[PDB]
Design a protein around this ligand. Sequence first.
Ligand SMILES: Cc1cn(CCn2cnc(-c3ccccc3)c2-c2ccc(C#N)cc2)nn1
Length: 116
Amino acid sequence: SMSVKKPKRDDSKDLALCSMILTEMETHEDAWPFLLPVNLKLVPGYKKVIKKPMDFSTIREKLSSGQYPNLETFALDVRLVFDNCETFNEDDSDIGRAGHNMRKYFEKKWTDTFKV
Ligand SMILES: Cc1cn(CCn2cnc(-c3ccccc3)c2-c2ccc(C#N)cc2)nn1
């Protein structure tokens, strides 16, 4: 509260660490469904169904341009990629399976990097 500050974690490295995580995600072999925004002409339904599109290239742009206030806002956009993927794709599809794999991959890096 006013004049009563909790010690807070050192956030000085967060930009570099998030960039590294993103690089790792961009180079994963299962990243192909997520590298660029979904093309609304090739993909019937995505426009109406997915209210907040997101993809790795949009995250990279936002990260490079100071549009994440903090590391949680970054993680929210990564998770949004995978949540949108699950909304739109059967678990059993190649893209569905890709999204599950990429989510697991991200979350371990997240925990390892910042929960420690
Ligand atoms: C780009 C692009 C390519 N395509 C057609 C192949 N495709 C079909 N569905 C998806 C999709 C749907 C939901 C969530 C993620 C991917 C895609 C697809 C979209 C983007 C990329 C990239 N990069 C690859 C495939 N659409 N946009």
